[PDB]
Amino acid sequence: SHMEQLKCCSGILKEMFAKKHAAYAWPFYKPVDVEALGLHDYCDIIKHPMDMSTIKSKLEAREYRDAQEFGADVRLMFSNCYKYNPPDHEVVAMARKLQDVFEMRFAKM
């Protein structure tokens, strides 16, 4: 059911916020600070920013009809990171480590 599915999504996002993954998850906790040095072009490249705190707020406001809608925002968050940064950037390796956590849980729910 969609209700149980969404409860599982909340559980996946709670693990993504956990201390276990904090060493690589922290760039994704809050919206990208577009005022920070080096990020002056973020809004020109990334048309739909997304982060974990925004996804948590959307789950709380019932903005996802189902797990597929939630999963689309988590994957949008990673895709933004892959699109914006050079492929060898430290933040892309962190996105991949976090996406490993997400994909494994999302597949097994």
Ligand X SMILES: COc1cc(=O)n(C)nc1-c1ccccc1Oc1ccccc1
Instruction: Give me the residues that bind ligand X (CB under 6 A), please.
Output: 27-28, 32-33, 36, 38, 81, 84-85, 90-91
Judged by CB, which is closer to ligand X: 30, or 65?
Answer: 30
Helices (H), the chain: 2-16, 22-25, 42-45, 52-60, 67-84, 90-108
- Least Å from the CB of residue 29 to ligand X: 9
- Least Å from the CB of residue 7 to ligand X: 27
Taking alpha carbons only, the member of 100, 98, 50, 96 closest to residue 76 is 50
- The token pair at 76 is 């949008």
- Least Å from the CB of residue 38 to ligand X: 6
